[model samples]
Target: GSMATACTIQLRGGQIMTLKRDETLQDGCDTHFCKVNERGEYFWEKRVTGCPPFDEHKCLAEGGKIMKIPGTCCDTCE
Candidate 1:
């Protein structure tokens, strides 16, 4: 199955674009010891990995609970 959605790009100034979900990543078959370079379009990939982990939010009273995430295009903050 394939899914693609339009999202806004920062550098392009509100330009709507489609970012496709590659099956290779979803299937976990992309581990080829590859390297990703740093550049303008890297933040989305970075956020996917850098988002806070469960344990990191375990201490706060409202932690581990969903909160309003600003500047996010998705319904879930994550």
Candidate 2:
């Protein structure tokens, strides 16, 4: 009996990926998580983190630039 039990995927940046079932990585401005579908094949999962309502007036004083999030519109501090 042969069965596929390994999670593997490739990123768009030409990077080869190999994960064990539950694996995670920082994909640029977003994040990447590995998971297996019902067919026992691994796939890329994206997570869009949310930022609460807040002001970055302090960030300006400290010279911290604003962070442009990919999936969030709230102003952020870098």
Candidate 3:
């Protein structure tokens, strides 16, 4: 018989999500992700995603409020 190496992970305010490897959660909005290692040990990791490449000048100088907007990487108006 094969040994079990799968991980059972869940969050406080959200449901559980299982993955074969380290990656970002589907509905995590890139706010919180997960990390699974070769030792079968897994844990949740938080990595705030940022805008790829935009005019930081305009995004900050005139942007509403450098905030995380829905359906976007980052940068939005207040």
Clashing pairs in 3: none
Per-residue lDDT over 1-78 for candidate 1, one digit per residue giving the tens place of the 0 to 100 score: 442232222321243333333211221111212122343222234123223333424435544444432332222222
Model 3 TM-score (2 dp): 0.34
TM-score per model over all chains: 0.17, 0.39, 0.34
Task: List, residue by residue over 1-78, the lDDT tens digit for candidate 2.
Answer: 675565565654577767666787645544667777887877667665766675688788888887755553346788
Scored by CA lDDT, what does every candidate get? 0.28, 0.65, 0.53
Candidate 2 C-alpha RMSD relative to the actual structure: 6.4
lDDT of 3 at 56: 52
Candidate 3: where is the Cα deviation over 4 Å?
Answer: 1-13, 28-30, 49-68, 71-78
In candidate 2, how many Å is residue 18 off? 0.3
Tell me how candidate 3 scores on lDDT: 0.53
Which regions of candidate 2 are displaced past 4 Å? 36-43, 48-78
Candidate 2 global CA lDDT score: 0.65
Which candidate's lDDT is highest? 2
